[PDB]
Design a protein. Sequence first.
Lengths: 107, 808, 116
Amino acid sequence: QAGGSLRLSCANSGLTFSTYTMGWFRQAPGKEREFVAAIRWSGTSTYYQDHADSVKGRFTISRDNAKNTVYLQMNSLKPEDTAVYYCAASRLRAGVKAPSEYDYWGQ
Amino acid sequence: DLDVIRQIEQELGMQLEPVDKLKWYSKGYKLDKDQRVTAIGLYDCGSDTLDRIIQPLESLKSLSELSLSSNQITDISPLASLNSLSMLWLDRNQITDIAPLASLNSLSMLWLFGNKISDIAPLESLKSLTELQLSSNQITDIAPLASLKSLTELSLSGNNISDIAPLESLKSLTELSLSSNQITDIAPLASLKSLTELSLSSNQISDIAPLESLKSLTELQLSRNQISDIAPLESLKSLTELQLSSNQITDIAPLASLKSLTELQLSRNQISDIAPLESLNSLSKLWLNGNQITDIAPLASLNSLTELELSSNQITDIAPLASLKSLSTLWLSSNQISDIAPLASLESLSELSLSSNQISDISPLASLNSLTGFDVRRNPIKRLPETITGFDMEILWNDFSSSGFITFFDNPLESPPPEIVKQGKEAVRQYFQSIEELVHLQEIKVHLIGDGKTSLLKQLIGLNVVTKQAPNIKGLENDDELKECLFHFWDFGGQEIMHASHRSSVYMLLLDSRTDSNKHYWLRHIEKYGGKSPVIVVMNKIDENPSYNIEQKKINERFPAIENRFHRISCESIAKSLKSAVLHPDSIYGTPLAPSWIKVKEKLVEATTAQRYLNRTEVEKICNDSGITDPGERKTLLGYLNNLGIVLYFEALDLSEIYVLDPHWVTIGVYRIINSSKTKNGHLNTSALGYILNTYTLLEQRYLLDIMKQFELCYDEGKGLFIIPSFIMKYDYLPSTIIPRLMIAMQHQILDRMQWRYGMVLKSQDHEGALAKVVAETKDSTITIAIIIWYEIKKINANFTNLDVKEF
Amino acid sequence: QLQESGGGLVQPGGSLRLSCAASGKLLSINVMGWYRQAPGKQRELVASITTGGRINYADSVKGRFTITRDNAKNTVYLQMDSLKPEDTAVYYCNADGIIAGLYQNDHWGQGTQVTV
Ligand SMILES: Nc1nc2c(ncn2[C@@H]2O[C@H](COP(=O)(O)OP(=O)(O)OP(O)(O)=S)[C@@H](O)[C@H]2O)c(=O)[nH]1
C-alpha cells in the first residue's frame, strides 16, 4: 500500500562475486533501466554504496554474505513510483562505478 | 470325465486347462489313455471350494493327484471318500484338524506347511508316504511319524518340537529340515546315513556329537545357536555349503581340513585368526563381519573369492587384499583402516563399505570404475578427490547404506561444504569447477577548508597531512562496512597563505558566523580546483549564536556536490555525512585495479618517503618492474597516486631532477618560505633560506628555490631580490594568487620597489611615458588599474574553468 | 536372500525400475512384493503379486506403480512413474517361500533409497 514497506531479496550463488557488483534497476514502462541502488560488497566490506533520486532513507540497500543475498527495503513508497525491479551484475575490473557494464541481468 | 471337469469349471467360474505333470501351483487337469481324469489342481479357488466340489470329485474314481494349495480352507472333512489319491497339496490354509486324512490308504506326497495343524496322529495309517512338508506349524510332539517308513524328504521346522527321538525309527531320509524349534540334543540323528541336506537352524544346540556319523551331507545350516567347538566337522570334507553364523567360536582350524567348500558365512563370533582359511582356494563367498580379527594377510591366497564381508573387525592394513582380482562386494566398515591405496587394482569391485574408520584420503580409490556401491560414512575425511565425482553414482548425506550411491555422514568436510555435498553430485561438480576457476584501493583524502579546524581535530582524538583508520574516527567505527578504509586529513588557514595545488577526495567546508560574508570564496574554490569531490558544509561555533542558520537549501542547489550534508554543531551527524560522502561514484574509495598496481604504489611510497623526489628514469624503472610502460597506464597510476595525496606529480615542473615529490616535505617547504616574517615586509633575502628552514639542506634549498620559481609564485629579480607578491574589474571568488602572477613581470613596468603586498606601481619603459599601478582589495574582491596589463590579467585568469568575471 | 537393484534421486514426475531377484535358495514363492519406509513412519505394503496372477495394491499408489513378475527366474520389477515427493523413502522386498526346508511368509531385502 502507499507509503508502506517491502523487502526484496535477490540471491546469487557460485559466481565471480569479487568481480561482480549488484545493482537494482526499476523500469516498468520501458524506462531504459534507470539506476536505483548498487553495491560492490566484498564480505563485510562495501565500496560503491550509492543511491539516486529517491536516495537513502526512502530506499535502503543492504547485502548479507551469510546467504549471498542483496536486500532492497522499500519505505514511504510513493504510488506513482510504480516500476518493476531487476538485478544486474557488473564484472569489469577497470574503472569503478560501471553502469554500462551491468551486462549479466538477473532473474 | 470332461463333463465333471466342466461342472467344476462352471461351479468355480475358472478355466481349468488340459495340462501336464501336476505342480503345486497348477489349475488344470491331466488325462490318460482313454481320457480319464487322474490329476486336478485347484490353486487359490477360495475358502469354500472343498465343501462344494466333493460330489463331482467322488463322481470320478480315477483321481490320484489333488492340489488345493493356498486355498485358505479350514475344514478338510470332505477329503475322506477320495481314497484313490497319491499326492496332496494343502499348503497355506487355516487347517487345524487332519482327522479326515485317515481313510486315504494310498498317499505318497503330502504338503501341509502353511497350516495351523497341532496333532499329527490321524496320518498314522498313511503307510507309503515319501514326502512330508510340515514346516511352520504349532506342533509340539512327533510320535506318529515313527510308524511312517519310506520317507525321503521331511520338513518339520517352525514348531515347538523338543523331542526328536522317533525320527530314529525313520531311516530312509535324504533332506531333513529341523529348525526354528526348541531342540537341545541331536543324539537321534546318528543312525541316519542317506541324509544330504540338514537344516538345524535356530535352536539351543551346543554339542554336535553325532554328526560325525553322517558322511554324505552337502549342505549344513547351523546358525543362531550356542555352539563353541567345530572339531567334529573336521573329519567331514564333502560339504559344498556349511553356514556357521551367530555363535561363540574362537578356533577355525578344523575348518582348514575342508577343500571343496564354496560359500562360508562366519559372522558374529570370537574367532581370532583366519589363517586356517589359507587353503580353501575355491571359496566364492566369505562373510567374516563382526569379529575380533587383526590380520588379513592369510586371506591373500583365495583368488576365487567374489564376495567378502569383513565389517566391524580390528583390521588396519588392507594391503594383503590387492592380490584378489575377481571381487565384487567388499564390506569392511567399522574398522581402523587408514589408506585405501592397495585396492586400486580391484578392477571388478561393485559394492564397498568403508565407513566408521579413520580414513582421511580417498584419492586412491579412483581407477575402480566398476563400483556400484561406496559407503564412507563416519570417517575423518578432509578433502574430496576429483575421482570422487567421477563415479556413476548419485550422492546422499543420509545414514543409510544403499547400493548405487555415494554416501557420507558425520564427516568434518571443510573444503567442500556439507550443504554443498548434500545438494548432489552436480552441485559438487559445479562447486569444484568454480574452485578451479581484483584488488581495491580503500583510500581517500579529506581537505578541511576553513577561512574550527581544531574543532574537527577534536573528532580525530595538525598542520595538514594526518592519517587515520576507521577505529580512529569517533562515531564512524560502529560501521564495519568501512573498517579497512584509510583517511587522509589536510587543513590550512590564513589570509595570504594560498596553496591551490599543495576528485579522489571529500571536502568538508568550515563556516563561522563572522566569516559567513566570505562564503562564496571557498565554495567556488572547491568547484574550480580540487575535483568533482563530495562536499560537506559544516557550521561551527553555534553556541555563541544559537539563532543563526544559513540558507542551506540555496547553496545546496547552487553546489551539486553538497546534496544536503550539513551540520550545525558547536564544540554526531558528521560521521554519517562522511560515510555517505566517501562511497560515491564521483570519488575513488573502492576502485578495482590490478594488484601489480598496488605493489608499484607501495614501492613508490617506499622510495619517496626517503628520496623525496623521483627521477623520470627511476619512475620508468619502477613502472617496468611490473612491465607496465604504457604512457596512459603510468599516467593513470601516477594520477591515482597524486589525487590521493601520497606522492605528488605536476605537469608543469619542467625539471629533470624531480619527477614526483613527497607532500610531507615538499609542501611544508613552500609553507615555510611563503611566510617567515621576512616575506611579510615583501622581499626575501638573497639566499637566506637556511635562516628560514634549518632533513633539509642547501641542495634541497636550491631544489625548492627552482620549484617555487616553477610554480609561478615569485620572481628572483636581481642581486638576490624576491617579490613574493602574496580599469574596474570584479571577480567572484577573487583568486588569491592573481597578484603573485601579475607581479612576475618585474623587468617590465615598475616605478621603484613600490609594492603593497596587495598592490604595486608600474612605470612603462615602452614608447612614451606612462605611470601605472594595480592594487587588490580582498574585502571587496576587486582589482584597480591606474594609468598589456589587461593581456597579462587575461593570461593569468585563463588558468580557470568557467570563472565568472565582471568589468566596469 | 533377495537382492535389489535400482534406486536413486529422481526429479518429480520421473520414473524408476526397482528390480528384485530371489536367490536359488528360495524355493516356493507364492507372494512377492514391495514395501516402503518413510522417515519416521512404519512399513506399508506397496504391491504384492502371486504365482497365480493376483495383484494387491496399496490404494495409495493405485494406477501409479506397476508390479511385474517372472516365475521362471524368480524376479519382481516395480515400474514407478510420476513419483510425488511423498515417496522419498527406502523400499524393501517382501517374499514368502522356503529356504533349506523352512517356510516364512516374510523374507525381507536390504532396502534401497528412492529420493525425489
Ligand atoms: N576553548 C575553546 N576555543 C575554541 C572553540 N572553538 C574555537 N575556539 C577558538 O578558536 C580559535 C581557532 O579558530 P579556528 O576556526 O579553528 O581558525 P583556524 O582553523 O585556526 O584558521 P582557519 O583559517 O583554518 S579557519 C582557537 O584559538 C580556539 O581557542 C571551543 O569550542 N572552545
